[PDB]
Every structure is written in C-alpha cells, then in structure tokens.
Design a binder for this molecule. Structure first.
Ligand SMILES: Nc1ncnc2c1ncn2[C@@H]1O[C@H](COP(=O)(O)OP(=O)(O)OP(O)(O)=S)[C@@H](O)[C@H]1O
Lengths: 53, 380, 413
C-alpha cells in the first residue's frame, strides 16, 4: 500500500482544482485550473467530511 | 590627389592584402559554446503564491496555464523562494530553479534616463540662493552622509520648484542630472494617464518598486498638474481617475514606512491649483522658487549666452540688461540669437551694439503682446 | 600650479580607496591611491598599510612614494629617507627605486645605491640594482653614458636568477640608448647577445633582453642592424623571436608597405609569439594614418591577436569607434584578456568614463579581473619615453614579481 501511494504521491506536480459539487450515487465533480470539468466516481485519499463545494 | 590616390592605394593594399587571408583561411565565434548550451534548459518563469510547512512543498501559478504544487531542485537555496516571487520553473518536472526580479511593466522601464544630458551649473548663474538650497537637498546626503549623521537630523526628502515658465526649472534639473551620480529617473506628468481605470496607480507602484530596489536614487516629477491638483466634487463625477492616481502618489510617497533613500523633485508652472496634501511638508518640504532675474541676473545671463559667441567685446552689457525689466532667460537667449541673425543680414563676423538694440526692439517690444508672463506672474 | 587651478576631492581616495581588501586589490589600491597626483597626503597616510604589504608589492609601495611625487627634489630625500636603509630589502630597494622615479637631474642618489650594487649572485643589492639601475635609467640620457654601463658589465656578468636584473639591464641601457646615432651594434648589446645566447633559461630573459636590444636599435634611420643581428642571432624561435623584436623596433614607420605585406604573410606563422610582437608593431608603424589602423584582428581567432589590437588602440583621445571595439573587447572570458582590456581601455580615456568601469563590475560581479579593474580605475584617474614601458608591459601573464616592475611604465607628466 505504501509502494502504491509512493508511486502516486511522488508525482510531485499536483494540479490544483476546485470541487464543484458532491454526488452520492461518494462522487465528486472537479473543475481544474485549466478550466476542464472532470467527473470521478472514486474520490481518493480525502474524506467527505473535509470536502465542501 | 596624392593623399587621395596614395591613401586609396594604401588602404586598398591592406584590404586586397588581407584578401589573401580571406581566400586562404578556408558564427563559429560561439558555435561550440552554443552547442554546449544545448544541454541547457528552456526554464519557464512563474509566480509563487505560498509555501507549506515542515517541507518546501511550494505552490505556483504559472501565468495562464494552471496552478501547480511543486518541489525545489537541488541547486537552489531553501530560503530565497519567498512568496510573490518570479522564479524559473522546469517545463517537464515543474521544479523551481532561480528567483528573479519582479515584473517592471516595460513601459515604465523607458523612463530611466540611461544617459547624462550635458548641462553645467554655470548655465544657471544669477540664482545663487536657489542653487545653494537645491544643492543642500539633492547633492549633499548622497555624497556626504557626515554632517547629517553626526548631528542627528534627516534631510528634506522632497523639494518642489515653481515660478513663471521658462525660468530655469528644467535647466536646473538637467544641471543636477549632469552631476547626479545616482539613478536619476525622469517622470513626465502625462505618463500617468492611461486608457484604463487605476492603471496609473500601478505605474506609480512600479516607480516605487524601482525606487526601493536601487538604493540612493533620484526621481524627477515634471508638470505635476496633470497628475492631479484639486478634488472638485460635484454631481457629475468628472476628474476622478486622475485624483485616485494622485492619492496613490501621496501614500506610497510618505506615510506608514516612509520612502527610503529616494528624493523627489517636482516642477510646475502654476503652483496654485494644488491640493494641500502635497503642500504638507514631510512630502514636499522646501518651496524653492524662481523669480525673475532682477538686474544683475540678466547681466550674468548675458555673460552666459555671450561667452562663446562672435561679438565685438568693446560694447557693454549693462545697458542691454537695463532694457529688459520683466524678462526670462529664454527671452535673453532669443535676444542673443536674434542679434546674431541680424548680423547674418549683412556679412559680418562680429556683432554691433546696434544689432543687439535691433534684437531688443525685435523681441521684447514687438512680441510683448504675447510675452507669456502677464498672466502667469499672478499664477493663474 | 597643479595644486592651484585644480581641486581634487577625497571621496575617490576613500571610495576608490575603499574598494575592499585582499593584499592585492588593496595592494593595487595603494598604487591607485599613490598615483593620485590635494597634497602628498596618500604618501604620508600613517603606517600599517605597507606592513600588510608583501615583497614585490612592498617594492611597489616603496616606489609608490616615488609615484606620488615626481618633483620635490629636496622633499624626495627627506620623505624616502625613513624608508631608505630600512629593515626590509624591498623597502630600501624600492626606496632607491622611488629616488630614481622622482627626478632625472639629481644624480646624487646614484652613489648610495651605486656603491652597494655588487652581490655576485643573489644578495639584497641586486634588487637595489633592479630599482636603481632602472631608476637611473629613468635618471639620465647622455651622448652615451659609459660609466653606468661599465657598472652594467658586472650586472649582466652577475646574471641573477631574478628576471628583472637583466630586465632592467636591457631596458635601462636601452633608455640610455634610445635615440642612438642610427643605433649601434656595440659591445654593450653585442655582449648581452652573446651572454644572452650563453644561457637558454627562463624565456622571459629571451623576451626582455630583445626589448633592450631593440631599444638600442631605436634611433635608426637606415640601420642594417636587423641584418647584423640576423646573422649573429637567429636560431630556434627564442632568438628568431629576438629577430622579430629587432624587426619590430628597427622599423618605426613610413610609407614602406612591403613590410606590411611581410606582416601579412609572416603574421600567419605557426609560432604564436612572434605573431604577438610582430603584429604588435602596427601601433608604432601606422600611428599617424590611423584610419587604416582599424583592422580585422578581432575577426581573427588567435586570441593573443585580439590582445594585439587591444594594445593597438592604446591611450590617445579614443574616438567612438575605439570604444565601439571595446564593446566586444570588453566582453571576453579569459582572465589575461579580460585583464588586458581595462588597461588600454582606461589609458585611452585619461556615465561616460566610469560607465565601462561599472560595466566591468557587471562583468565579474577572478582575482586577476579584480586587479585588472583596479588597473582600469588607475587609468581612469613619437616620443620614445611613452613608447618603451608598455612594450615592457607586454609579458603581463605572469607573477606579481613581474608586476613589481609593472609600476615603471612612467609615461605621464
Ligand atoms: N536663469 C536662467 N539663466 C540662464 N538661462 C536660462 C535661465 N532661465 C532659462 N534659461 C534658458 O531658457 C531655457 C528655458 O528654461 P526651462 O527651465 O527649460 O523652461 P521650463 O522649465 O521648461 O519652463 P516651463 O515651460 O514652465 S516647463 C533654459 O533651458 C535655458 O536655456
């Protein structure tokens, strides 16, 4: 598990973004700083309490 | 002929003689060095928002692309990567390499003087007290911080100048700009008038950026009436952008961490429509003024404009000065040059007294209907 | 009248005399302060500045009180007298050097130095021989002074491993011998040819002995002495470099373009120091028709050639084309050539003037470069007397022991 999160988190450029809304059908919607809207069904390594639009 | 043909033969002999080296030797003055600059880097520049804790973990807005979280490379110092700092960032791996000076708004770069116009102190004789006071402010602390420290004072960091037009304001400024030794920075007052709202404010910001970067410099303001004089308030909303530019000029000049090693000279023709926030000392301290040269001043200015010209030295100059009661140095210059032009009517090499009398009754009594100072002596 | 009509301030003593420290730049600064001449103030500025100083710079500072005061005959003895016969060899030898600097008509400073000179290999008075044979070369130019040259026979017969013994031998007897009656091939310089080819060691000897050889060749109008030394001298390129030195000095300049196309062909010689002096002859030759003097030496690549044009501008009034050549010559990376640019750059001008100086501060900010900058600052602030000492300077890429004589190019009032 640490090997995989090393293989992901050592990718040091983090594109920053903004959470647009939060679906539940646990699903977050992202607009990056390049202004490209992204969907993701899998949130990742943050908790839904710490998120707000 | 002999010099011409022999110089042609010698110079073309050297030329056609080195032509043997030209056709025998077979840019590269940097080619191997430039191909060793091929392992160099493209190095895109950016802007930093903030840092993070326990680690570098730096955050960057590039300029338009996006905002990225980055790390520093190994050939950097972990200290001088502070916030709001234009740094060069790798294109591939997005890593910070070198911090640099900030954005200077290049239309503001072209008002540093970069030269020295040749104007000597001898050209403003007959104004001894004004030269003395302006010397005392501008020249002395940059060359001698000795009396000012060992007695414990602060010199007046601002001096305004005024008077009738054509009295020597511009000329005294240039006389300082000869012997300045500092980063003399010209500012025309109309440079702060742009198409868009609050843009001249940013110009003033960048002026004091350049001022705070380079220690012990001079900034010259020129015709500050365009920059802003009064805050006439009505139900129209008229002259307001100029007013905000003037207020931003006020605050970043003097107040709440004052200016540093910078001296401001202003020069106007009509010092009467000025908001007294500028008239408060601490910003504009010495009110040095230029009146008209009374009697001996014009004798001395005749000595100034006459010392390097073809005249008949058997004439006097006092009688010439006695016919010019309210006159500027510009009118004196016109008198001297026009007396020369009357000498060009005939074919002579020396002036006469009558030439200068023609010049006086040509300039003063004839064009005294215009004369530029019956309504600026009242400082309208 | 120099003190009267001029009024020079103190903030270049203090500011230009503040340019930091490091016993070199500081040592140079003493020289810069010293060549200030408003009084002989930097002369009498206390103590502990020359005690920081070291051997050949102690020669330079002991001579620097000579350099502040090339007048005050009575004051020269009573200022140098403290530094005369002192505890240090370099203080006393540079002190008699200063006595040779200050004047040229006294000739009573000879005997305290003249008496001591003999050491027979390498004792103290040979360094007094360097400052006093050189400073007496500064002192007199007779029909042929012969007594000082009979003193010079145990000098070249002495032949110390110190270069500037035979250096100021050749240069000093040349200063005696410049302007000779179509030169001479006499037993003086004939003796230093034979005793030159006696010992092939320390090639600075093989450079600075043909200096004084060509100085004795000066005074020519028609001299066949290049053919005479061509028969006696020429060999392996040490003495073929002596051949190109006599070829330089025997040919002051006329309408004689055949040696200029000789210059074109033998300019391409594979030995690249006869290139240096042989191409360096140009500022002697075409000094009057100076419009042809711009050449493509910068467009060549044998970097000492860019050094040669860098010499060839020099010191006169220096028009915008010359400073335009200092646009490129100002920007180079080798420390002997970046060292070589501010010297003639500020000789040619004796902001504006200080604008290329602060540009050199933009260039570096090595130690050589700092020294070069100091030299440039010093510069900032066919008479043979101005023709000799910079060709004496032309071997600069060397020790500060050589730079102990660097302050003997006395070509300015
Ligand atoms: N007191 C003076 N002594 C000698 N020459 C003078 C004097 N006053 C003016 N002149 C000459 O006349 C010129 C005009 O003076 P300026 O200072 O340039 O005028 P000004 O400062 O532009 O006035 P304005 O129109 O209000 S900006 C100077 O540049 C000098 O050549």
């Amino acid at each position: 598990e640490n090997s995989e999160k090393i293989k992901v988190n050592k990718t040091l450029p983090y594109l920053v973004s903004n959470v647009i809304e939060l679906l539940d059908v646990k699903c977050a919607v992202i607009k990056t700083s390049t202004r490209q809207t992204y969907f993701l069904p899998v949130i990742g390594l943050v908790d839904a309490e710490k998120l707000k639009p | 002929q002999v010099e011409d043909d022999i110089q042609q033969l010698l110079k073309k002999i050297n030329e056609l003689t080195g032509i043997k080296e030209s056709d025998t030797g077979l840019l590269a003055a940097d080619k191997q060095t430039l191909q060793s600059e091929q392992p160099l880097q493209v190095a895109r520049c950016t802007k930093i928002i903030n840092a993070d804790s326990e680690d570098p973990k730096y955050i960057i807005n590039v300029k338009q692309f996006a905002k990225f979280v980055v790390d520093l490379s190994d050939q950097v110092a972990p200290t001088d990567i502070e916030e709001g700092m234009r740094v060069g960032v790798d294109r591939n791996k997005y890593q910070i390499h070198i911090p640099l000076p900030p954005k200077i708004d290049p239309t503001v770069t072209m008002m540093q003087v970069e030269e020295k116009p040749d104007v000597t102190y001898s050209d403003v004789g007959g104004c001894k007290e004004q030269i003395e006071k302006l010397r005392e402010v501008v020249e002395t602390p940059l060359l001698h911080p000795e009396r000012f420290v060992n007695l414990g004072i602060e010199p007046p960091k601002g001096v305004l100048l005024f008077g009738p037009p054509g009295t020597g304001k511009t000329l005294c400024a240039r006389a300082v700009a000869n012997r300045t030794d500092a980063c003399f920075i010209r500012v025309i007052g109309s440079e702060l008038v742009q198409k868009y709202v609050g843009e001249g404010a940013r110009m003033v910001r960048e002026l004091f950026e350049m001022a705070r970067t380079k220690k012990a410099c001079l900034i010259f303001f020129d015709e500050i009436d365009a920059i802003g004089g009064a805050r006439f308030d009505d139900g129209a909303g008229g002259d307001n952008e100029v007013q905000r530019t003037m207020l931003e000029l006020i605050n970043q000049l003097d107040g709440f961490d004052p200016r540093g090693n910078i001296k401001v000279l202003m020069a106007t023709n009509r010092p009467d429509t000025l908001d007294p926030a500028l008239m408060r000392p601490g910003r504009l301290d010495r009110k040095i003024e230029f009146s008209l040269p009374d009697l001996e001043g014009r004798t001395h200015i005749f000595k100034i404009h006459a010392r390097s010209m073809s005249v008949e030295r058997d004439i006097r100059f006092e009688l010439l000065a006695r016919l010019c009661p309210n006159s500027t140095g510009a009118e004196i210059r016109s008198v001297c040059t026009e007396a020369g032009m009357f000498a060009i009517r005939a074919r002579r090499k020396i002036a006469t007294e009558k030439d200068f009398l023609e010049a006086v009754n040509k300039v003063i009594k004839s064009y005294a209907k215009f004369s530029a100072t019956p309504r600026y002596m009242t400082y309208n | 009248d120099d003190i009267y009509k001029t009024h020079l301030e103190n903030n270049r003593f203090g500011g230009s005399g503040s340019q930091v420290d490091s016993a070199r730049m500081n040592l140079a600064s003493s020289f810069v302060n010293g060549f200030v001449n408003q009084d002989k103030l930097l002369t009498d500025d206390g103590n502990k500045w020359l005690y920081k100083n070291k051997d050949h710079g102690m020669l330079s500072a002991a001579a620097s009180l000579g350099m502040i005061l090339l007048w005050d005959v009575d004051g020269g003895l009573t200022q140098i007298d403290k530094y005369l016969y002192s505890s240090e060899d370099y203080i006393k030898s540079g002190a008699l050097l200063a006595c040779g600097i200050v004047n040229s008509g006294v000739r009573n400073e000879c005997d305290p130095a003249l008496a001591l000179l003999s050491d027979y290999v390498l004792h103290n008075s040979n360094t007094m021989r360097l400052g006093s044979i050189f400073g007496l070369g500064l002192a007199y130019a007779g029909s042929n002074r012969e007594d000082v040259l009979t003193l010079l026979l145990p000098v070249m017969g002495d032949s110390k491993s110190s270069m500037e013994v035979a250096g100021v031998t050749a240069l000093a007897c040349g200063m005696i011998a410049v302007g000779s009656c179509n030169g001479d091939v006499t037993s003086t310089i004939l003796q230093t040819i034979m005793e030159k080819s006696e010992t092939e060691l320390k090639d600075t000897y093989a450079r600075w002995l043909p200096l004084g050889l060509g100085l004795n060749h000066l005074g020519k109008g028609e001299a066949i002495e290049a053919i005479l030394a061509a028969l006696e001298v020429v060999s392996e390129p040490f003495r073929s470099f002596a051949n190109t030195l006599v070829d330089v000095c025997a040919y002051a300049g006329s309408g004689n373009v055949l040696k200029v196309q000789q210059l074109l062909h033998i300019c391409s010689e594979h030995f690249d120091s006869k290139e240096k002096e042989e191409d360096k002859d140009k500022k002697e030759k075409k000094d009057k028709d100076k419009k042809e003097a711009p050449a493509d030496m910068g467009a060549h690549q044998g970097v000492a050639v860019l050094g040669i044009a860098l010499i060839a501008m020099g010191e006169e009034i220096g028009a915008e084309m010359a400073l335009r050549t200092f646009g490129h010559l100002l920007r180079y990376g080798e420390p002997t050539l970046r060292r070589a640019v501010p010297l003639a750059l500020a000789l040619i001008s004796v902001s504006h003037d200080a604008d290329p100086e602060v540009s050199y501060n933009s260039i570096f900010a090595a130690r050589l470069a700092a020294m070069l900058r100091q030299l440039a600052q010093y510069h900032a602030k066919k008479g043979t007397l101005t023709l000799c000492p910079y060709h004496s300077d032309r071997q600069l890429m060397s020790q500060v022991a050589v730079a102990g004589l660097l302050t003997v190019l006395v070509s300015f009032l």
